[PDB]
Design an enzyme around this catalytic site. Structure first.
Site, PDB file in Angstrom:
ATOM      1  N   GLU A  10      21.001  13.704 -14.205  1.00  0.00           N
ATOM      2  CA  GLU A  10      20.241  14.872 -14.634  1.00  0.00           C
ATOM      3  C   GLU A  10      19.253  14.496 -15.699  1.00  0.00           C
ATOM      4  O   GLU A  10      18.916  15.320 -16.564  1.00  0.00           O
ATOM      5  CB  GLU A  10      21.120  16.024 -15.106  1.00  0.00           C
ATOM      6  CG  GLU A  10      21.650  16.773 -13.890  1.00  0.00           C
ATOM      7  CD  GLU A  10      22.278  18.157 -14.191  1.00  0.00           C
ATOM      8  OE1 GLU A  10      23.261  18.513 -13.500  1.00  0.00           O
ATOM      9  OE2 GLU A  10      21.835  18.870 -15.096  1.00  0.00           O
ATOM     10  N   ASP A  19      28.466  11.340 -11.813  1.00  0.00           N
ATOM     11  CA  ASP A  19      28.877  12.721 -11.695  1.00  0.00           C
ATOM     12  C   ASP A  19      29.142  13.023 -10.231  1.00  0.00           C
ATOM     13  O   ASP A  19      28.223  13.218  -9.408  1.00  0.00           O
ATOM     14  CB  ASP A  19      27.833  13.660 -12.304  1.00  0.00           C
ATOM     15  CG  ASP A  19      28.275  15.096 -12.219  1.00  0.00           C
ATOM     16  OD1 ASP A  19      29.340  15.415 -11.602  1.00  0.00           O
ATOM     17  OD2 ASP A  19      27.573  15.978 -12.768  1.00  0.00           O
ATOM     18  N   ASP A  50      22.439  16.764 -18.667  1.00  0.00           N
ATOM     19  CA  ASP A  50      21.922  18.143 -18.492  1.00  0.00           C
ATOM     20  C   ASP A  50      20.483  18.225 -18.948  1.00  0.00           C
ATOM     21  O   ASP A  50      20.106  19.125 -19.746  1.00  0.00           O
ATOM     22  CB  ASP A  50      22.810  19.146 -19.238  1.00  0.00           C
ATOM     23  CG  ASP A  50      22.643  20.601 -18.757  1.00  0.00           C
ATOM     24  OD1 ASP A  50      22.135  20.838 -17.611  1.00  0.00           O
ATOM     25  OD2 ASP A  50      22.926  21.492 -19.615  1.00  0.00           O
TER      26      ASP A  50
END
Ligand code: 6FV
Ligand code: MN
Length: 248
Positions: free
Chosen positions: A40, A150, A10
């Site tokens: 990310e 992911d 993130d």
């Protein structure tokens, strides 16, 4: 044997980023995996990894906006080559990053991606999953192929893609679907997104190709479950730590 972590960290969250990158690097130092697959990532986050996980070589493909990376432990993992497989119809700059390496006397094809996000982009995520799985089957037969990433998958999207091929396995399914690591994005247990609704999904997954009586998953565990000093976790995702071994 190979041990690795996959983790959507993130980087798009600018709040507490340096502390959270410290949190991720603490996990890398404690678990000391051979390989880390990250999604990310953003530019400042790479800078952090170069200083605070300096014994990992950072392999990237394109770095526009946010991106994936494969980290290789120096002295354990030898880089051989890289391949980038584009997703021509992505709307989110997603692609498939492949790195061929040697480790422990064995050849590996290590893959990661952040597949197309959101429920609205289901059909494209499914197309991308098919590309990933086809690429896994095309690798040379003496290579161990591992995808860890992911996937944003949910519901029956794997079945809609045509299913896992006969020679590809999901590590969590292979270990009997243990409850302790069944969710990797869990808004009840994870507070990083300040959102009212409960959601527990298994976005982050590991696929490996069969090679008949050689490496298989021996363990799978969540990482990133310790709150940091700021009262949040390193990421809104949990990471996955996985070891594969040979059982003769
Ligand atoms: N805010 C919020 C919010 C709250 C609750 C849910 C619950 C689900 C669910 O039960 N199934 C599902 O497939 N996706 C869900 N998302 C989701 C998660 C990421 C996403 O990009 C788009 C939707 C949620 C998102
Ligand atoms: Mn995010």
């Amino acid at each position: 044997t190979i041990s690795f972590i996959t983790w959507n960290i993130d980087g798009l969250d600018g709040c507490n980023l340096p502390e959270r990158a410290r949190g991720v690097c603490s996990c890398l130092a404690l678990y000391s995996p051979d390989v880390v697959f990250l999604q990310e990532v953003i530019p400042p986050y790479c800078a952090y990894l170069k200083k605070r996980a300096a014994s990992y070589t950072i392999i990237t493909g394109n770095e526009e906006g946010y991106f994936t990376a494969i980290l290789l432990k120096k002295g354990r993992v030898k880089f051989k080559s890289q391949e980038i497989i584009p997703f021509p119809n992505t709307k989110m700059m997603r692609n498939l990053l492949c790195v061929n390496v040697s480790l422990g006397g064995n050849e590996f094809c290590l893959m990661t991606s952040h597949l197309e996000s959101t429920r609205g982009h289901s059909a494209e995520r499914i197309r991308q999953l098919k590309t990933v799985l086809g690429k896994m089957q095309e690798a040379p037969d003496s290579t161990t192929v591992i995808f860890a990433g992911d996937t944003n998958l949910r519901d029956r999207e794997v079945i809609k893609c045509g299913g896992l091929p006969d020679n590809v396995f999901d590590a969590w399914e292979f270990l009997g679907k243990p409850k302790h690591c069944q969710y990797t994005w869990d808004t009840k247990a994870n507070n990083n997104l300040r959102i009212p609704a409960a959601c527990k999904l298994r976005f982050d997954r590991i696929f490996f190709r069969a090679e008949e009586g050689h490496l298989i998953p021996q363990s799978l565990d969540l990482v990133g479950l310790e709150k940091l000093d700021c009262g949040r976790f390193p990421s809104d995702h949990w990471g996955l730590l996985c070891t594969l071994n040979v059982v003769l």
